[PDB]
Design a protein around this ligand. Sequence first.
Ligand SMILES: [Mn+2]
Ligand SMILES: [Mn+2]
Ligand SMILES: [Mn+2]
Length: 280
Amino acid sequence: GRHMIRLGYPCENLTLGATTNRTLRLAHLTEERVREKAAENLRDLERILRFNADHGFALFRIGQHLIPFASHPLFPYDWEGAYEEELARLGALARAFGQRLSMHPGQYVNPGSPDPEVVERSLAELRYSARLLSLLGAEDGVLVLHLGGAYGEKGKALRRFVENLRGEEEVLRYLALENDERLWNVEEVLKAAEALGVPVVVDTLHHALNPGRLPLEEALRLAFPTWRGRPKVHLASQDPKKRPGAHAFRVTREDWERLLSALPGPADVMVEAKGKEQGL
Ligand SMILES: [Mn+2]
Ligand SMILES: [Mn+2]
Ligand SMILES: [Mn+2]
Protein backbone atom coordinates (compact mmCIF):
# COMPACT_ATOMS: atom_id res chain seq x y z
CA GLY A 1 0.00 0.00 0.00
CA ARG A 2 0.83 3.74 0.15
CA HIS A 3 3.15 4.70 3.06
CA MET A 4 4.95 8.05 3.77
CA ILE A 5 8.04 5.81 4.05
CA ARG A 6 9.10 4.39 0.67
CA LEU A 7 11.36 1.35 0.46
CA GLY A 8 14.17 0.24 -1.82
CA TYR A 9 16.90 -2.42 -2.21
CA PRO A 10 20.24 -2.37 -4.12
CA CYS A 11 21.65 -3.75 -7.35
CA GLU A 12 19.91 -7.08 -7.82
CA ASN A 13 16.73 -9.01 -7.10
CA LEU A 14 17.13 -12.49 -5.65
CA THR A 15 13.59 -13.64 -6.51
CA LEU A 16 14.03 -12.93 -10.20
CA GLY A 17 17.74 -13.78 -10.35
CA ALA A 18 18.01 -10.35 -12.01
CA THR A 19 21.11 -8.25 -11.58
CA THR A 20 22.53 -4.99 -12.81
CA ASN A 21 26.11 -5.93 -11.79
CA ARG A 22 27.43 -8.29 -14.44
CA THR A 23 31.04 -7.56 -15.30
CA LEU A 24 34.05 -9.16 -17.04
CA ARG A 25 37.83 -9.56 -16.80
CA LEU A 26 39.81 -6.78 -18.39
CA ALA A 27 41.37 -9.35 -20.76
CA HIS A 28 37.83 -9.91 -22.10
CA LEU A 29 36.81 -6.29 -22.52
CA THR A 30 35.89 -6.41 -26.22
CA GLU A 31 33.11 -4.20 -27.62
CA GLU A 32 31.16 -7.37 -28.36
CA ARG A 33 31.42 -8.87 -24.88
CA VAL A 34 30.80 -5.55 -23.10
CA ARG A 35 27.72 -4.85 -25.25
CA GLU A 36 26.43 -8.31 -24.30
CA LYS A 37 26.89 -7.81 -20.52
CA ALA A 38 25.47 -4.27 -20.71
CA ALA A 39 22.42 -5.53 -22.60
CA GLU A 40 21.77 -8.19 -19.94
CA ASN A 41 22.19 -5.63 -17.16
CA LEU A 42 19.79 -3.22 -18.89
CA ARG A 43 17.26 -5.99 -19.54
CA ASP A 44 17.47 -6.86 -15.82
CA LEU A 45 17.12 -3.17 -14.81
CA GLU A 46 13.79 -3.12 -16.68
CA ARG A 47 12.70 -6.42 -15.08
CA ILE A 48 13.49 -4.96 -11.69
CA LEU A 49 11.60 -1.69 -12.22
CA ARG A 50 8.55 -3.70 -13.25
CA PHE A 51 8.90 -6.05 -10.26
CA ASN A 52 9.23 -3.04 -7.99
CA ALA A 53 6.07 -1.44 -9.38
CA ASP A 54 4.15 -4.68 -8.59
CA HIS A 55 5.67 -5.30 -5.15
CA GLY A 56 5.74 -1.79 -3.65
CA PHE A 57 9.40 -0.83 -3.84
CA ALA A 58 9.85 2.77 -4.98
CA LEU A 59 13.68 2.86 -4.74
CA PHE A 60 16.38 1.04 -6.56
CA ARG A 61 20.15 1.36 -6.53
CA ILE A 62 21.65 0.53 -9.95
CA GLY A 63 24.91 -1.52 -9.80
CA GLN A 64 28.18 0.29 -10.75
CA HIS A 65 28.75 -2.36 -13.40
CA LEU A 66 25.49 -1.58 -15.33
CA ILE A 67 27.80 -0.58 -18.19
CA PRO A 68 30.89 -2.66 -17.26
CA PHE A 69 34.17 -0.63 -17.14
CA ALA A 70 32.42 2.50 -18.50
CA SER A 71 34.91 4.81 -16.70
CA HIS A 72 38.01 2.66 -17.49
CA PRO A 73 40.57 4.11 -19.96
CA LEU A 74 40.19 0.92 -22.04
CA PHE A 75 36.43 1.05 -22.46
CA PRO A 76 35.94 0.19 -26.18
CA TYR A 77 33.06 2.51 -27.37
CA ASP A 78 30.92 5.62 -26.73
CA TRP A 79 28.51 4.12 -24.20
CA GLU A 80 26.53 7.39 -23.94
CA GLY A 81 25.75 7.43 -27.70
CA ALA A 82 25.08 3.69 -27.61
CA TYR A 83 22.60 3.81 -24.70
CA GLU A 84 21.13 7.31 -24.43
CA GLU A 85 17.87 6.36 -26.19
CA GLU A 86 17.45 3.19 -24.19
CA LEU A 87 18.23 4.95 -20.89
CA ALA A 88 15.73 7.74 -21.65
CA ARG A 89 13.07 5.03 -22.18
CA LEU A 90 13.94 3.17 -18.97
CA GLY A 91 14.15 6.44 -17.04
CA ALA A 92 10.70 7.42 -18.36
CA LEU A 93 9.37 4.05 -17.14
CA ALA A 94 10.90 4.53 -13.73
CA ARG A 95 9.30 8.00 -13.42
CA ALA A 96 5.96 6.63 -14.65
CA PHE A 97 6.20 4.07 -11.83
CA GLY A 98 7.16 6.84 -9.33
CA GLN A 99 10.52 5.18 -8.74
CA ARG A 100 13.67 6.89 -7.47
CA LEU A 101 17.05 5.72 -8.76
CA SER A 102 20.44 5.92 -7.16
CA MET A 103 24.00 4.68 -7.33
CA HIS A 104 26.61 4.04 -4.65
CA PRO A 105 30.20 3.89 -5.92
CA GLY A 106 32.37 1.55 -3.89
CA GLN A 107 35.12 1.80 -1.30
CA TYR A 108 37.76 2.39 -3.96
CA VAL A 109 36.23 5.71 -5.17
CA ASN A 110 38.20 8.14 -3.04
CA PRO A 111 38.13 11.84 -4.14
CA GLY A 112 40.04 12.78 -0.94
CA SER A 113 43.00 10.54 -1.81
CA PRO A 114 46.37 12.29 -1.85
CA ASP A 115 47.33 10.14 -4.87
CA PRO A 116 46.52 12.02 -8.10
CA GLU A 117 45.86 8.82 -10.14
CA VAL A 118 43.39 7.54 -7.48
CA VAL A 119 41.62 10.92 -7.57
CA GLU A 120 41.43 10.84 -11.38
CA ARG A 121 40.02 7.30 -11.49
CA SER A 122 37.57 8.12 -8.70
CA LEU A 123 36.30 11.25 -10.46
CA ALA A 124 35.97 9.25 -13.70
CA GLU A 125 33.76 6.72 -11.89
CA LEU A 126 31.68 9.55 -10.31
CA ARG A 127 31.24 11.27 -13.69
CA TYR A 128 30.08 8.03 -15.30
CA SER A 129 27.62 7.46 -12.42
CA ALA A 130 26.25 11.06 -12.57
CA ARG A 131 25.97 10.90 -16.39
CA LEU A 132 23.98 7.65 -16.07
CA LEU A 133 21.55 9.38 -13.68
CA SER A 134 21.30 12.31 -16.11
CA LEU A 135 20.59 9.98 -19.10
CA LEU A 136 17.91 8.24 -17.07
CA GLY A 137 16.41 11.66 -16.24
CA ALA A 138 16.47 10.67 -12.58
CA GLU A 139 14.94 13.95 -11.24
CA ASP A 140 15.68 13.30 -7.54
CA GLY A 141 18.40 10.71 -8.26
CA VAL A 142 21.04 10.03 -5.58
CA LEU A 143 24.74 9.30 -5.95
CA VAL A 144 25.79 8.21 -2.47
CA LEU A 145 29.42 8.34 -1.31
CA HIS A 146 31.37 7.74 1.86
CA LEU A 147 34.05 10.25 2.82
CA GLY A 148 36.72 7.62 2.38
CA GLY A 149 40.00 7.06 4.16
CA ALA A 150 41.39 9.44 6.74
CA TYR A 151 44.88 9.05 5.10
CA GLY A 152 46.68 9.85 8.31
CA GLU A 153 45.02 13.25 8.95
CA LYS A 154 41.19 13.79 8.78
CA GLY A 155 41.26 17.55 8.33
CA LYS A 156 43.46 17.38 5.24
CA ALA A 157 41.50 14.34 3.89
CA LEU A 158 38.20 16.22 4.13
CA ARG A 159 39.82 19.27 2.53
CA ARG A 160 41.01 17.24 -0.49
CA PHE A 161 37.57 15.53 -0.72
CA VAL A 162 35.74 18.89 -0.90
CA GLU A 163 38.31 20.62 -3.10
CA ASN A 164 38.38 17.75 -5.63
CA LEU A 165 34.55 17.68 -5.87
CA ARG A 166 33.62 21.38 -5.74
CA GLY A 167 33.91 21.97 -9.52
CA GLU A 168 32.03 18.75 -10.43
CA GLU A 169 28.72 20.39 -11.43
CA GLU A 170 26.95 17.29 -12.72
CA VAL A 171 28.19 15.05 -9.88
CA LEU A 172 26.99 17.61 -7.31
CA ARG A 173 23.47 17.52 -8.83
CA TYR A 174 23.14 14.00 -7.36
CA LEU A 175 25.82 13.59 -4.72
CA ALA A 176 24.84 12.83 -1.12
CA LEU A 177 27.26 11.85 1.66
CA GLU A 178 26.94 8.93 4.10
CA ASN A 179 28.35 8.34 7.58
CA ASP A 180 30.36 5.18 8.29
CA GLU A 181 31.09 2.82 11.15
CA ARG A 182 34.74 3.75 11.76
CA LEU A 183 35.91 7.11 10.44
CA TRP A 184 33.17 9.68 9.85
CA ASN A 185 30.13 10.17 12.03
CA VAL A 186 26.94 12.04 11.19
CA GLU A 187 28.16 15.31 12.72
CA GLU A 188 31.35 15.11 10.59
CA VAL A 189 29.50 14.28 7.42
CA LEU A 190 27.08 17.22 7.98
CA LYS A 191 30.09 19.52 7.96
CA ALA A 192 31.43 18.05 4.70
CA ALA A 193 27.97 18.11 3.13
CA GLU A 194 27.44 21.76 4.14
CA ALA A 195 30.76 22.66 2.48
CA LEU A 196 29.73 21.10 -0.85
CA GLY A 197 26.04 22.02 -0.64
CA VAL A 198 24.79 18.43 -0.74
CA PRO A 199 22.51 16.19 1.35
CA VAL A 200 23.41 13.74 4.06
CA VAL A 201 22.40 10.09 3.98
CA VAL A 202 22.09 8.68 7.53
CA ASP A 203 22.94 4.98 7.72
CA THR A 204 21.29 3.60 10.85
CA LEU A 205 23.73 0.73 11.44
CA HIS A 206 26.83 2.91 10.89
CA HIS A 207 25.31 5.46 13.18
CA ALA A 208 24.72 2.84 15.91
CA LEU A 209 28.37 1.74 15.67
CA ASN A 210 29.77 5.30 15.40
CA PRO A 211 27.14 7.71 16.87
CA GLY A 212 29.38 10.56 18.04
CA ARG A 213 27.25 12.50 20.54
CA LEU A 214 23.93 12.11 18.70
CA PRO A 215 20.93 9.79 19.27
CA LEU A 216 19.43 8.45 16.01
CA GLU A 217 16.51 10.89 16.28
CA GLU A 218 18.82 13.87 16.39
CA ALA A 219 21.00 12.56 13.54
CA LEU A 220 17.88 12.30 11.38
CA ARG A 221 16.52 15.69 12.55
CA LEU A 222 19.82 17.28 11.45
CA ALA A 223 20.06 15.40 8.15
CA PHE A 224 16.46 16.07 7.05
CA PRO A 225 16.93 19.78 6.14
CA THR A 226 19.89 18.91 3.88
CA TRP A 227 17.51 17.46 1.24
CA ARG A 228 15.50 19.48 -1.28
CA GLY A 229 13.50 16.36 -2.08
CA ARG A 230 12.62 13.46 0.18
CA PRO A 231 15.46 12.43 2.49
CA LYS A 232 17.13 9.14 1.79
CA VAL A 233 18.13 6.99 4.77
CA HIS A 234 19.97 3.58 4.88
CA LEU A 235 18.56 0.82 7.04
CA ALA A 236 20.62 -2.26 7.83
CA SER A 237 21.05 -4.71 10.70
CA GLN A 238 24.36 -6.11 11.99
CA ASP A 239 25.25 -9.55 10.56
CA PRO A 240 25.48 -11.28 13.95
CA LYS A 241 29.08 -11.81 15.08
CA LYS A 242 30.71 -10.67 11.83
CA ARG A 243 32.81 -7.52 11.25
CA PRO A 244 31.08 -4.40 12.68
CA GLY A 245 28.98 -2.91 9.90
CA ALA A 246 28.47 -6.14 7.93
CA HIS A 247 24.84 -6.42 6.81
CA ALA A 248 22.51 -9.15 7.94
CA PHE A 249 20.40 -11.12 5.45
CA ARG A 250 17.24 -9.49 6.86
CA VAL A 251 16.76 -6.27 8.87
CA THR A 252 15.40 -7.04 12.37
CA ARG A 253 11.92 -5.85 13.41
CA GLU A 254 13.66 -3.94 16.23
CA ASP A 255 15.91 -1.96 13.86
CA TRP A 256 12.97 -1.19 11.57
CA GLU A 257 10.78 -0.09 14.47
CA ARG A 258 13.58 2.03 15.92
CA LEU A 259 13.92 3.79 12.58
CA LEU A 260 10.17 4.28 12.17
CA SER A 261 9.98 5.81 15.65
CA ALA A 262 12.96 8.09 15.07
CA LEU A 263 11.98 9.49 11.64
CA PRO A 264 10.94 13.16 11.86
CA GLY A 265 8.81 12.83 8.71
CA PRO A 266 8.37 11.10 5.31
CA ALA A 267 11.54 9.60 3.86
CA ASP A 268 12.89 7.05 1.42
CA VAL A 269 14.53 4.05 3.08
CA MET A 270 17.16 2.02 1.18
CA VAL A 271 17.16 -1.43 2.83
CA GLU A 272 20.75 -2.71 2.76
CA ALA A 273 20.57 -6.44 3.49
CA LYS A 274 21.99 -9.51 1.82
CA GLY A 275 18.37 -10.59 1.21
CA LYS A 276 17.80 -7.64 -1.17
CA GLU A 277 14.05 -7.42 -1.92
CA GLN A 278 13.58 -10.00 0.88
CA GLY A 279 15.65 -7.90 3.28
CA LEU A 280 12.75 -6.46 5.28
MN1 LIG B 1 27.86 3.45 1.90
MN1 LIG C 1 24.82 2.38 4.01
MN1 LIG D 1 27.07 -0.41 5.72
